[PDB]
Design a protein around this ligand. Structure first.
Ligand code: PLM
Ligand code: PLM
Lengths: 267, 267
């Protein structure tokens, strides 16, 4: 495919899920070969693993004293839409959570796609690789297309389920929201996070119930989101990816680990 | 004591806990002998049991097609401060929840109290009375002062605790917030309520944990609030009350029941 970018400036705004603070986005179009980079306080931060400063319950980036929290969703969509050259201006400290999924971005970015005369130089996974971290494991091998599978071993009623994304199936995961278990909320708030969380932006699961009155969108909405997450994380390799990934009980932390140990192979 | 009222117009505003909608309050001063009555869409609704239309997880009042949800807190404070003649203008369908306690009202009403030349005609409990409703029971006997005790048999870590309010101890309960356990937030949202609830306005308790990061104000904050509730409910007798009340596992529903079966004795 050819490198892409937005037709014109696009903006989004809302509360950040962790900071609980308001922030605004302004996606700027960029010349070819530019790449994805955020812009905060006159400082450009590249959507590349080198600038990852936090992978707890979000993937945060930073440079020269400027930090942006939760870039996974915005990046994931840009990765799905194969938008390669743009500048994400952030007026705050974290990309807005919106409805908890990548739906709003997708729906708006998709419209304003602008083709360009330059064949995308994809990041190809050249050979098998694995990464562990206590039960948690991710396996990535070579593939003609982008294919990602996530398998969960949920302690609650969800049980063991897994989902698989393949090119042409974006609309199947850009709608999955963010989730957390109830035995998953005190801790988060205590370590100073989720200040913006609510049933309107987050999907809360009980030991065997769903708090949100709106129920689950998909039987396996959680697993889907995790796949969405991984994709966006993977975009930190600096360009659309092409490989076959298997993630069992993954998380941003391990996600990044892979990415780093996957680029450290000068690939 | 003498009948009281506010020095001048006082107003409050915020989200309603159940409706999730915005609403505004405007407490108007009223001539002597007026009483407590709400004012909605050019319709006056008396703070009297006759106009109670709902006692689920709030005490709602209504008349000629006009309804106000959650009047207990506002009434409870007015009852504690012995403010007898005022008009509560409501622009919406429910008194604002504010921080979940009667703190804000108290602190603001207390300032603007205006004495009047007219001895309050208290509602005296003349003789013993009891009301049941499956395990739940309230006992009310005669007393020189206002004395209310609430005892809980909480299924979670709280266990069995009780609190007792006596005249001169208002500041001990006007600060207790509203509470709910994790088990049924679902239920509440499903039966169309708590649309405004959040950890900022509600104190959520787990099977053995406290979600709110701000912890409990008082070891027994819940039981206290229940006492606050009862007091405000009791003010639906149409005038400050003087009796000794015992409530074991009570709730607005039973509260009102008592009040009704307590006034039905032409007392
Ligand atoms: C109104 C009720 C509220 C409860 C608020 C939920 C607390 C927020 C928890 C944050 C989710 C953590 C998981 C991170 C996943 C992601 O990257 O989206
Ligand atoms: C994860 C959970 C969410 C936060 C939302 C809380 C749900 C709203 C609960 C409404 C409280 C009802 C009981 C209080 C009655 C009163 O104040 O008189």
């Amino acid at each position: 495919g050819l490198e892409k970018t937005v037709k014109e400036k696009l903006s989004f705004e809302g509360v950040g899920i962790h900071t609980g603070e308001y922030s605004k986005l302004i996606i700027h179009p960029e010349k070819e070969g530019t790449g994805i980079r955020f812009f905060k306080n006159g400082v450009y931060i590249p959507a590349r693993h080198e600038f990852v400063v936090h992978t707890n319950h979000s993937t945060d980036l930073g440079f020269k004293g400027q930090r942006i929290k939760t870039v996974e969703h915005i990046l994931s969509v840009l990765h799905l839409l194969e938008i390669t050259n743009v500048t994400i201006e952030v007026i705050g400290n974290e990309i807005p959570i919106l409805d908890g999924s990548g739906w709003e971005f997708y729906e708006a970015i998709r419209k304003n796609i602008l083709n360009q005369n330059r064949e995308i130089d994809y990041f190809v996974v050249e050979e098998p690789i694995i990464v562990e971290d206590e039960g948690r494991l991710i396996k990535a091998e070579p593939s003609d297309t982008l294919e990602v599978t996530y398998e969960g071993e949920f302690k609650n009623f969800l049980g063991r389920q897994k989902f698989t994304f393949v090119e042409g199936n974006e609309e199947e995961i850009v709608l999955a929201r963010t989730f957390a278990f109830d035995w998953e909320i005190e801790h988060i708030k205590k370590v100073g996070l989720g200040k913006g969380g609510s049933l309107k932006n987050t999907l809360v699961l009980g030991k065997d119930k769903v708090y949100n009155p709106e129920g689950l969108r998909y039987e396996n909405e959680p697993v889907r989101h995790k796949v969405f997450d991984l994709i966006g994380d993977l975009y930190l390799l600096g360009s659309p990816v092409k490989g076959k990934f298997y993630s069992f009980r993954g998380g941003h932390s391990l996600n990044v680990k892979l990415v780093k140990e996957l680029a450290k192979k000068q690939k």
